[PDB]
Amino acid sequence: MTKVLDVLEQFLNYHGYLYMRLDGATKIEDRQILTERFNTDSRITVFIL
DNA sequence: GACTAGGGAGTAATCCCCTTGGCGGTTAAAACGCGGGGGACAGCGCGTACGTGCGTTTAAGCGGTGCTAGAGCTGTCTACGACCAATTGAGCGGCCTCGGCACCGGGATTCTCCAGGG
């Protein structure tokens, strides 16, 4: 459920976690750069899809 | 006359196709905002084309007339139209194409803007 994602988001911001998201309302190029950035790097902790 | 055999309907189980709602993904149309510029409109001047006063006539209303050819109603008949159905064919109800329409691409053609010099 998409309504769950933001429910997680304000939760994740409550714990000071570094995270990002990917759902069906994201532009294709933004989606590709997001997954490319997540493949590298290590500070970003959780990816919610 | 007593009981026997078989099949479509009565009862019933199988299938299974058909949809009710909700929810997510994704493209297209609608929604919103800015730079700038062209359309709206004021201020004005004028001239010349009507707005208006008065003289001097033709003309509709006036007042009447003597009828004259077209309009309304009186018979009267008779050519014709609204009354059954057999028909039987003119035409519609349902299906099966291939062709013109749908629509997009490569190109020639054409319509428009600018910053300069000419």
Swiss-Prot record:
<protein>
    <recommendedName>
        <fullName>Helicase SWR1</fullName>
    </recommendedName>
</protein>
<comment type="subunit">
    <text>Component of the SWR1 chromatin-remodeling complex composed of at least ACT1, ARP4, RVB1, RVB2, ARP6, YAF9, VPS71, VPS72, SWC3, SWC4, SWC5, SWC7 and SWR1, and perhaps BDF1.</text>
</comment>
<comment type="similarity">
    <text>Belongs to the SNF2/RAD54 helicase family. SWR1 subfamily.</text>
</comment>
<comment type="function">
    <text>Catalytic component of the SWR1 complex which mediates the ATP-dependent exchange of histone H2A for the H2A variant HZT1 leading to transcriptional regulation of selected genes by chromatin remodeling.</text>
</comment>
